[PDB]
């Protein structure tokens, strides 16, 4: 009774391991960007174009 | 190489390499022309706008979901769709990658057959797998038995599946989803005062939805506690200020899953076609699968939701069995993680169908062997 | 070296190593095939699952018994089932190990040359020995006359014996056994609303028999009790619920036995075909077989059969003979002890047929002087 039961885990392993090793693919997406500020010193321009 | 795991869905694209814990990029599948004129000159106005980028111009946009229930109605905008995705969210070219769709049950072949021959002829990708949208659900949970709910936002169905052997004479594919929970909240609210008409505004009635709806337990006795008291009124800030107050349309919305006679739909509830596919399958099967009900897709994601189907359940089912619903905290995904976890294996690296089996027998590859 | 006492039986195999006291390994004889799809990817999943493994897994498998009535329809599968009990259930490589088969009597001769040439090419064993299933029943009850009624649950044979000197002219072999009687019980379950159909819900069937039914002393009386009271309805819990109550469903599944016009076969029962395997004896050795008729098999479990079948012979036999029924509590695996006996004997050891002896007369050897 133990073997079968033990047997049922054993394979369920492998369903962890599909589980749980395939995450670490990539995850370094949670990583933000810069999303710089000005500090009032991003301000170079005029009002001579704005089409483009 | 690595593979892309992409999810077409109904609603919300959801993509990303094969291996990881959650998809790259999630954005909204809608593709909208402007509808107004435009008087600026130079002002790189282009002619449509898809994902993401059109829920902020949405105030002048006229979107259109590609994709109805399940099937695609609309190829040339889901071309575009895809071509965005590739190129823009992910900006990897699809030639120098495999790619593994996925597909709702019971859909028609043309449908398939057509993605099949979109992503050989015109993205040009080396190789494409399509998968039911149930067992990559499946796979996420770790399970290998147990039945399946998937209700996202097109088409609810429901796979059951016993030890890696899918039965295919129980999947009960019902076509009632999130979207038709958004047009009936839009058509309730209408009740109080708010009328919400534009295809724009089907996105302000959405967002009320996700925030504020919630599935009762019992439902008679909240519709007489939320007629006599007031504390269930909670009140919701517009786009532009003018604050709504909801009542009682907040549980009547989500109501419609278990009674599908609110819109007009004949069928029953999900709490009854899930018992109806249970006792479609083997009288020897139906403990584990009783024991090992799963919920996935985004409209599961209801706050009380799995006890109120875990009442119904018990309600229906024999009184000795124990009935058991698994609910993870990440059900929005859970396709695309059991998508990336399948790709990834290493017994499924030689299911893909490759370029040169599709020149030898066409686009109707897909029904073959090579499913 | 210990030699293989193996009794392939029809229903259940029963094998263990000459010289102890129960089988080691006892697992039903069923190979069983998948019959669905299949949509998970490296789970493992075999081809053919024996023995007691597709006992657990019956939900979504065609289990098929090998063995018919006494003679094998299906070579393979039972070369399957022979290689798992050798290598899984004992764990010895037939290379060094003696093998005692078992045969029921008047069987095809075919069967029993396949048999032997089975067990000296393929699994290339040093020597095997076949003997009648109902002298090894005579072994365990430690007599040396006697008429045995072996009623298996392949087929029902009675074999006279006195002195050690068997009868062959007397010996009275019937097909009626355990596996008709699950069907009928299965049949007449259809009166109350129970509907078994598949091949899996024939071992529920046979669980209900096992469990529940009885012999009657007298059927008159018992359906006439049944018919008023309510003191017989026991239930039953299947595999997921919803309890079953038999009637006098009872004492009428194991009646069959006595009246085989149940189920259309014309023959007498197992009371009259004792009494005229009996009487085609000589005059002077019926007291001694009226004295010491013994029971065997698994389907002689019956609770109440050695009172009713005592009171039927008593009824057919001449009012002075003394009848006497022998029911051991180790009737199940009578013919195996009686196996691991005979095995176990020093005069015996002779006996065998000698890989030698084979490989100069061919398979034919069996039916030659090495019996
Ligand atoms: N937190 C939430 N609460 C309630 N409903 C939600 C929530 N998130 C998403 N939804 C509903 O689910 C839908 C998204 O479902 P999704 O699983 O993305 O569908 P698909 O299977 O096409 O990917 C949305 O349209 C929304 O109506
Ligand atoms: N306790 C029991 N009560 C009633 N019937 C039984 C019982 N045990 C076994 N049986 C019947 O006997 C059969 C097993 O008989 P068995 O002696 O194993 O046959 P074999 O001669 O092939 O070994 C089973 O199919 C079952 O129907
Ligand atoms: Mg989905
Ligand atoms: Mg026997």
Redesign the pocket.
Known sequence: LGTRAKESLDLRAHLKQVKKEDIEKENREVGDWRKNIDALSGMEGRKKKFEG | TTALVC?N????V?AGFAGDDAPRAVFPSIVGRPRHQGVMVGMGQKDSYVGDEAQSKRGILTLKYPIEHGIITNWDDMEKIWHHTFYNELRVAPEEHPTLLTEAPLNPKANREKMTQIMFETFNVPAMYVAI?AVLSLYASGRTTGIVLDS???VTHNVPIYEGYALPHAIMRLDLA??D??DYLMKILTERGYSFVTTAEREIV?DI??KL?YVALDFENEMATAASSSSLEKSYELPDGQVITIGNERFRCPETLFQPSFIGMESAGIHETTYNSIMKCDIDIRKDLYANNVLS???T??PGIADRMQKEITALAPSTMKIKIIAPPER?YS?WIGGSILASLSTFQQMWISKQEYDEAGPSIVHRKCF
């Open positions: 999810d869905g109904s609603g919300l959801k949208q996202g936002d097109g999130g979207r929970l958004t959405r939805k996700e709806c897709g985004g409209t994601m209801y929005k396709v």
